[model samples]
Target: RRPGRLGDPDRCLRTDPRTDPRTVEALAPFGLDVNAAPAPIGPDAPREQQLEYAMGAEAAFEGVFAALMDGLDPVPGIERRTETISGPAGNEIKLYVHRPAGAVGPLPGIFHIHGGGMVILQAAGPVYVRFRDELAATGTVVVGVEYRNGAGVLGPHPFPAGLHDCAVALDWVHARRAELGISTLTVAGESGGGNLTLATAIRAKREGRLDAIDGVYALVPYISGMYGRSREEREAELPSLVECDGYFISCDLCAVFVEVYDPGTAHLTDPLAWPYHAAREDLVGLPPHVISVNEVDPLRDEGLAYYRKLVEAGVEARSRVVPGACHAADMMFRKAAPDMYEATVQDIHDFVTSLHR
Candidate 1:
C-alpha cells in the first residue's frame, strides 16, 4: 500500500491462520483447553456478590506486576514522571509520563492506556512501564491513563462513559500542545487498554479530533467480548496445545471480566463490550495505526483483524504478531522472555519515531 513502507498484512495474527503446534503444546499446562470455545457467558445472574471476586483480582494484578518489575531494569534514555489529568466528565485520572530527557519544547505526545480488562484499576505497573519507558526513551511524552474501573462507583462501564473520559483527556492534551511541547499526538494501550486506545481514536475521528494524532499504537487489544466465538474456534481446533488452549483460557477470563463489568446487560454484542461490532466506517479519516500481538494470545486474532480492517479502509496501519510469544508475554520484560520486550520496544520506537521529521 505504501510502496515498501507497509509490511505483509497477511502476517497479521487475524489474517494468517498458521498454528504453531510445538508452541501450543508447551502452553497446555495453563488449564486452557484449545478445544473449548467460550460459551455465551450471557448476563450475570445477580452479580452483586461477584464484585468481591472482581476486587480479589487485584491480588493477581499485584503478583503479575511484581513479576514484571522483577524482570525489568533501569532503562536508559527515558525520563519518567507521573501526573493526574481531567477526563471528559471532569473526573481526574492518573497519568504516568515517560519523556526523553532534556528534550526541547513541543514534542509528540502519546496517551497510553493500561490493561485490566475494564474491571481493575492499575497503573502501567510493570507491563505498562516497559512500553511507557520505551516511548519516553524516544523523547515522547507518554501519558498512561488510569481511567475508571467497573469496580468503582459507576453504573455504565466501558461505554460512551469511559471512552468519553479518554476522549476528554486527549482533547486536553491537544489544547495544551504548545505548553506541553507536544506537536503530534498518538494513543497507545495494551489488552483492555488497547481496546480503549482504538475506541478513543475512533471517537476522536468521529468528532474531528484526529487532527492532533499521528497514529495509534495498539498491543493485543480485547476489541470485542464476542471474541468468545473466536476463542471457542481456536480451542475447538487445537485442544491440547497451550498456545491453542491459551486462547480459550483467555476467553474464560474475558467472560469473567464481562460478567463483573456489565451484569445487567443482556447482549455481549454491545459496542461498549465488543468494539469490533462498532461501526468501522466511523474509523474513517483517523490517523495511522500500529497493532502488535503475541502469537499465543486469544486476542491475537482480533488484534490483527482490526489492523487489517484499518489497512483495507485506506488508513495507514502496520501490523505484526510477535514470534514465539504468548499473551502478555511482554510482562516478562527481562525475565523469562527478554526478547519479546526488546522486539516490542523496537517495533514501537520505530513506528513512533517515523512520524517525526
Candidate 2:
C-alpha cells in the first residue's frame, strides 16, 4: 500500500470477508486486484490516449454486463420511444423514454443520466438501457439522456456540453409533463451522472426554475474533483479517496476523467462542474435529495459530505449507503447482487413518489 493511504491496503473482495460472495465469484474471472495500481490516465496523458481508455472501459463493461445479464428475461412490456429535442446549443439531444405499459395515471418521471465520469458511457448502451428498463418496470417513468461526454464514443466534447444537454432535456420534460404523463419530475443518476444530477438542481435554483425538478437521487455520485490531487491532500478530508482507492476503480483513473471533462482544470471548483464544492446557499431552497453511496467505494465520503452540506443548508436531503459494495456496485453488478440492485431501484422509485405534493 502507498504510505498513509486511508483505506486498508490489504483489503480485497477475494480475500475480505465483508465482500458479497456473488460479487467475488462474478469478479473472479475478471481477475481485478485491488492492490494492483490502475492503468495510468493522468492529466499529462494525451487526449487520444485518455479517450481510448474511456472507450475501452465502456466497451468492456458492456460486454461483461451482457454476460451477466445472459439469461435473465428482459424487463418486458415497457412503452419505450426516442424523442429528439434541440438543446440550448442547438445540438439534437435524444431522450430514451420508458413507462410501464398500459398503466393509466400520470407517473413520477425520473430523468436518468448514465455514469462514466461524464467522460464515458452512452445512455443507449445495454448496461444503462437495462437499468433504465428495470427502473421503468418499477412503476415510474424514466428518461435516459444522451448527453455528450468528454472522451467516449459520443465525446471529444467537453464540460457544460453534457450539462447543457441535461438542462435542456430537463426543461423539455417539465414543459411537456402533461403530455409525458408525469405527475412529478426527479433528476437521477449514478457516478458521473450523479454529478450532473446534483448540478442540475443547483442550476435550476440559479435560474429561478426550481420547478423543473422535484427530487434528486444521486447514487455513488462522483462530485469531488480532488481525485486529481495527491493522496495526502485528497484523503485529509475524504479518506475514502485513499481507503477505498482502487477497490475496483483507481484514484489515478478517476483523475483522468476529471482532467478530460474539465480541460485546463479551470472549472474544478465550479459548483456546476463539481457539485462537491457547492456552497450552502447554492443548496438551499432546492428540491429534496437522496445522496446514496456504496460503503466500500472511493467516492463514499464526498457523497456523504455533500449530503451533510445539504442538511446544514436546510435542504431536505437524506443519504443511504449500499453495504459491502464498491463504486456503483448496484448499478454495475445488478446480476451479481440482485437484491441490492432491486433495493436501489425501489428506493429511487419511492423517492420520486414521495415528492408528489
Candidate 3:
C-alpha cells in the first residue's frame, strides 16, 4: 500500500490489541520520543554510513535490552563459562557455555546463535547471555556462538563469514558432545540466528556431516532475501512483509543488513544465505525441525514457507506461531512477556526431549 512504511496502526505492535499490553506500553514512548536518535540513516545511504548508523542503533538496542534484563539474576542453578576455539579460517571464535552448576553429564545441548540480523549483536551481549541462562535452567546445556557479523561492531565481514563461524561451532559441539556430556544437541536461535540454524544444518548436509546435528529450532527466522523487490511483488508473495512492516522492524531497515550480509545481493537465492530459497533436495534427510514464528513478525510468512518446504521434503517438522507478539518478542522482551518467554524456553527443551527419534 505504502511505498516504504506500512503506516497501519491496526497491524502495528503498539496499537494492536492482540499484542501483550505490557510490551505495548513499554514500546509506546519510543515511536514519537524526541529523545531517540535524530533519525536512522535511510537504506539509500552509502554502505559505510549505513553501517555507522547500525553501530549506533546497536548501542541503543543493547542499552535498552541491558536495562530490560536488569534485576533479572541468572537462574540459580545455571553456570556459565567462556571458551575460545579456532574457526576453519584460523580466526578465533568465542563461545559462552551454560549448564546446570552441579548437574551431571549427557544432557541436551543447545547450540545458540545470537540475533542481530546476523550483523549487529554479539552472542555475549546481556540479553543473549540471559537467554542461554534461562534455556540452560531448563535442564540443558547451552552454548552461544560469537560468530562473525557482516557489518556490526564485530565485523565488516560478509555473507558466508557469519555462516562459516556457526557451522564451525556446530562441528565443534558435535565433535565434543561426549566430552561436553551432551546427549541430544539442538541448533536454536532467533531472527538472523534462526537463519544460521537452518543454514548450518543445510551446510552440514552438503558437507556430508548431517549427523552432527540432531534437530533445529528456529524462532522468528529472517530467511527470505526477496524483500528488495517492489512493494507490489512483496504484497503478492509475502504479504506480511508489507502488512507487518515497521511494527517492530521494517523491511527497509532489514535491507541495511542485507546490503552488508550479501552485498550487492550476490548470493540472494543461495540456501546458505537465504534458506527460504532452499530446494526440497536440500531439506531431505535433514533432522527434524521446529520453525517457530511470531504472529506479528514481518518475517513470519517466510519462516512458515520454510516449514512448508520441510514438510514437502518429507522431513520431520513442526511449526508454532506465538500469537500476539512482535518479531522476536518471545525471546527479546523478556520482562514484558514472561509467560511467553518461559513457554518458548520450555518449547525448545521439549523439542530436545522428544528428539529420541
Candidate 4:
C-alpha cells in the first residue's frame, strides 16, 4: 500500500479551527470533510484508471462550487465562441472567447489559462463559468486558452507543449488586437494556470512583447517545483502551512504531476517551470501585478515569494492573503464563504479595470 499520512508520504487536513474558522464553519453545513486523507492510486493501476481517478477527483471537487452557484446566470452580453488554432508541434489548440456585447471602443484584452496541473482542463464547462462571466461583464474581451495537457495517458504532450500553446495564443490575439479592438493585453490564471501566467509573462519579456502586457493576475499560484522544499521551508515561517498535509492536493500528488509533465527532469530549472528561481533582471519592468495566496496552502509561500520578487525588482505589484482558506478553497468552499468569494471576484474586476489605458 502507498504510505499513508502517518508515514509523512500521506496526510490529513488541519483540524485547528483557528487556522481557518470560516472554512470550518462553511464546510460544516455540508457533509464535506476536508480533514481526511485522499485515497492513493494503486501501484499497478492502468493509465485509463489514473485518468478516471484524476478526473473524478476534479469533478467531485467542483461539484461543491456548482452547488454554491446554481442560481447565477451567465453574465449578460458576454458572447462565447470556440475557435481552433495550431499549437506546439502542429497540435490543434482550442480557444474560448468571451466578448462583451455592446462595447464600442478598443478595450483591454485578457488571455486566460486554466488550472489543472498541466494535466486536465479544469476550467471547462461550468467550473470557471462564473469567473469568465465576471471578467467579460466589465467590458473586457477574455480569451481562455485550452492548451494541450502534458499528460496524454496513452502518450505524452510534455513540457513546453502547454507553454508553447499559451504563447502562440497570446501571439495570435496580439496580432489581431486591431481587428478585435483591444487596447492592451494581460494574462491571468489560478493554481497551475497561475504558474503558466508567470511563465508566459517571462516569455513575453524575453520576446520583446512585455510592453504589450499591462498586468498579470495570479490566484494562489503554484510557482515552485514538486521536488523543491520551499513548502517545507515555509513550515517555520507560516505555521498554518502544515494544515494542508493530507488534503486533496499534497506534495506527493504534486510530485506525480511534475513527473508526468517532465518525465526526464529536463526543464526543472527553466524559469518557465519554476518562476521563483528567475533572475531579478528578467522580471524588471514587466507589468503591474495582482497576486493572491490562500492562508493555508502548500503553495502559499512560493506564490507570495514570487510577488515579493516582482515588487523588489521594481514592478508595480499588489498581494492579498485570503484568510481562513487553503488552495482553491475559494471555489471548494464558495457557498460557505460567500463574502470571500465575492471579494476575490471584485478584486479581479478592479485589477482588470485598473489596466484600462
Candidate 5:
C-alpha cells in the first residue's frame, strides 16, 4: 500500500455480479447511475421507487455473501485459531483468530465484524480475507467475530444479537489474550459492521467493559436515529448519492423493521438502535474513535453529525470524509473503484500503525 497521507480522487466504483443483481438493475432507474459524475438523485423518481431501491440494496447484500466463500482470501496469520465465547443465553459462541507473520510477541488485537445489511455475511467470506490481510499488514492480531444479524425479527432481536455477540466475543478475546498472543484491543467494521463496532462498544461501556477496549474504527456506519434525537449536520445540498429531500424512508417501513426485530429500540426514534439518536451527553470517556465516511453516500450527513458529537464530547477522535468516494467503494476490487482498496487500507494501516496498544 502507498505511504503518507492517503486520499484518492478517483471515486468511480464498478458493480460486479458479486453485487445484488436486482438492486444493480434498479439503481439507474432510481437515478443511482454512478457514472453520471455524482449528481444529486433526480427528484422525479417516485419515493416508493426509492424505497424499493433501498430494499433491493438490502437484498443485493444477501447475494454478495452467498458467493463470498469462493472469493475469500485465506488468513495469513495463525492457522485454525478458534475458541468459544460465552453468550448472553449461556450459549457457546465461536470466533476465529488470525495472527500476523513474524511477530515476536502478542500485538494489539483488532476485533472485526462484517457488513451485509446486518443480515448477511459469515466467518469464511470475502470480508474475512480483507480483515486477514489488513491485520497481517499492520502486525496486529485479528479476531473476526461471527456476530448476529438483523433477521428472523427486526429492531431489537437481531441487532441486539450482533451487539451482544460482539461484546461476548470481545470479552472472550481479552480473557484469552495471552494464549492468543495479543495485548491491546480495538474494534473495527464497515457498513453494518461499522454499526456493530460502535453499538457494541456502547454496550461494552454500559456493561462496564470499556476498560477492555482501546478504541473503535467505524467505517460508513448506518446509525439509524431511532434511538434518540439525532439532527442532520448538513442536508444534501444537491441530488447526489442520497436524494435526501426527494425521497425519505417512510415511517411505515421503519415500523415494519422495528416490529420484526426490536420493539424497544427500532422505533426510528430510539437512540440505541440509531446511533444518531444516541445522546451525545452520554458519551463520557467513550473509546477513542477513528471514524470514516464517504462524502457523497446516503449516510454521509448523519455520520458527520455523530463525528461532531464524538469530538464535542472530548473523546480522542479522528474523522475523515474521503473525497470523491461513495459507500462501499473501498471493498470493491474492480478497476471501476480503483482507489478504494488501496486508499482505505492505507488509512487503516496508518491508524493501526500509530496505535501502540
Candidate 6:
C-alpha cells in the first residue's frame, strides 16, 4: 500500500465486486479519459485562467457527452425559460425553469441545484439540462439554479456564498408559488449541489419556512469533509471505494476540492458545511428526504451516514444505492446506461409525485 498525503492507498481499495458490471462495461471504453488535471495545492492559478480552464474542460466533456447523447433534446412538450434572480450580496443568479407545456393549476415545484465540486459548471450546462427536462416531463415544475461556484478559481464567491444563493433562490421560488401554480416544493441537488440542498433546507427550517418544503433529493451529495473519516473506518464502511477505479473522483482529489471551496476549514464543523454533523435536533423536523448513493464513490458512506442520522431523528427518510456506480455515473454513462439513467429520474419522480398524492 502506498502512503501519500491523503492517507494509505490500501485504505482506498475495493475488495469486492460491489460495483455494477454494466457500469464497468459502460466506463471501460473511456480508459483514463476521466482523470482530473493536476490541480496545484493552495490558491490555484489566477482566477481568469482558472475560469478559462474550468469552462474549457466542461466544453470538452460536453462534446463527448453530446455525441453519446446522439442529439439529446429537451423532453417533448417541456417548456423552458431562463430568468435572472437576485442572489446573495447583490450578485445575479441565473435560473432555468422547465414545466409541462400548457399544463394548468398549481403543480408541485422543485428547486434543482447543479453540481461541479462547488467550482466548475453552470446550471444551464448539458448535465443539468437533461435533469430538468426529464423531471419536467414527469408533470412537475423544475427550477434549476445557477448559483455562484464557491471556489475562488471559478469566481470571487466562496463557502457561504453558494449556499446563500441557493437559499435566496428557494425564497424566490416560494414567493412566486401562486403565479407559478406551485402546490408544494422540493429542494434537490447533485454532488456539490446536494451539499447546498441540505444547507438551504437548514436555513429554511431556521427561518420557519420548513413546512413550505415537501422533500429533499440529495443525489450523490458531498455531505462530509473530504478527510473527515480515517482510512480504516471509511474503507470498512464503504468497501467499494478502494476497489473501484475509473470513477474519476478520488479521495485525494476530493480533499483538494474541499480545500479550494472552504479554505482554512472554517466551516468544517457547521451543519451547513457538513450535513453529516448536523445536530439531530435540527434534523428532526426536516422534510422527507431521499438520499441517492453511488456504490463505488468515495463520498458514499458520508451520505449513508447522514441518511441513518435522519432516520434516527424520526425524519421520513429513504436511501437508494446505485449498484456498480461511481460519482456522476448516471451523467457519465447516460448514453451506454440509459436504463440506469432513467431509473434515477424515475426514482425522483416517484418521490416528488408521491408527496403530491
> Which candidate gets the maximum lDDT versus the true structure?
2
Q: Write down the lDDT of every candidate, Cα atoms only.
A: 0.63, 0.85, 0.83, 0.71, 0.58, 0.72
Where in model 6 is the C-alpha error above 4 Å?
1-18, 25-70, 152-154, 228-246
lDDT of 2 by residue, 43-63 (tens): 789877887888888788767
Query: Which residue segments of model 3 deviate by more than 4 Å?
Result: 1-11, 32-44
Q: Which run of 10 residues does model 5 get worst, by summed lDDT?
A: 1-10
- The C-alpha stretches of model 1 lying farther than 4 A from their native spots are 1-43, 152-158, 227-243, 247-249, 270-272
Backbone clash total, candidate 6: 8
What C-alpha lDDT does candidate 2 achieve relative to the native structure?
A: 0.85
Candidate 4 lDDT by residue in tens digits, 1-357: 222232353343445333456666555544444554434763134555655665665566556656656765556778888888987678777778887887888877788888878766445546576677667777778888878775533125677788888998888888888877677788989888898999899888888877657889998887676432455664555323444554436665565566656666687778888676778977997889888998767677778888888988998899999876767777555555667877877787778778854
At residue 43, candidate 2 shows an lDDT of: 72
In terms of lDDT, model 1 sits at: 0.63
Model 3: per-residue Cα lDDT over 190-229, one tens digit each: 9999999999999999899877789899999999976666
Pairs of residues at least 3 apart in sequence or in different chains that clash in candidate 6:
12-242, 13-242, 13-243, 14-242, 14-243, 19-324, 20-324, 106-181
Tens-digit lDDT track for model 5 on 1-357? 211111222322223212233333334433443333321322234444433444554565445434432343544554447667677967566687777666888777788877654554565565465555655566777788876555521212344676777787888888777887777778888866787787777777678888668878888776753311112322222112222211112222332333334433434555556666667655667878888986545566667877887898888899887654556555543224435556776777667656655
Q: Per-candidate TM vs. native?
A: 0.79, 0.95, 0.93, 0.83, 0.71, 0.85
How many clashing pairs in candidate 2? Answer: 1
TM-score of model 5 (CA atoms): 0.71
Give model 1 RMSD, 1 decimal.
Answer: 7.1
* Shift in Å, residue 264, candidate 6: 1.1
| Ranking of candidates on TM-score, top first | 2, 3, 6, 4, 1, 5
Query: Lowest lDDT 10-mer window, candidate 4?
Result: 1-10
Misplaced by over 4 Å in model 5 are 1-62, 65-80, 152-156, 225-241, 244-259, 263-267, 334-338
Give me the displacement of residue 136 in model 1, in angstroms: 0.8
Could you list the CA RMSD of all candidates, in the order they appear? Answer: 7.1, 2.1, 2.8, 4.7, 8.4, 4.2
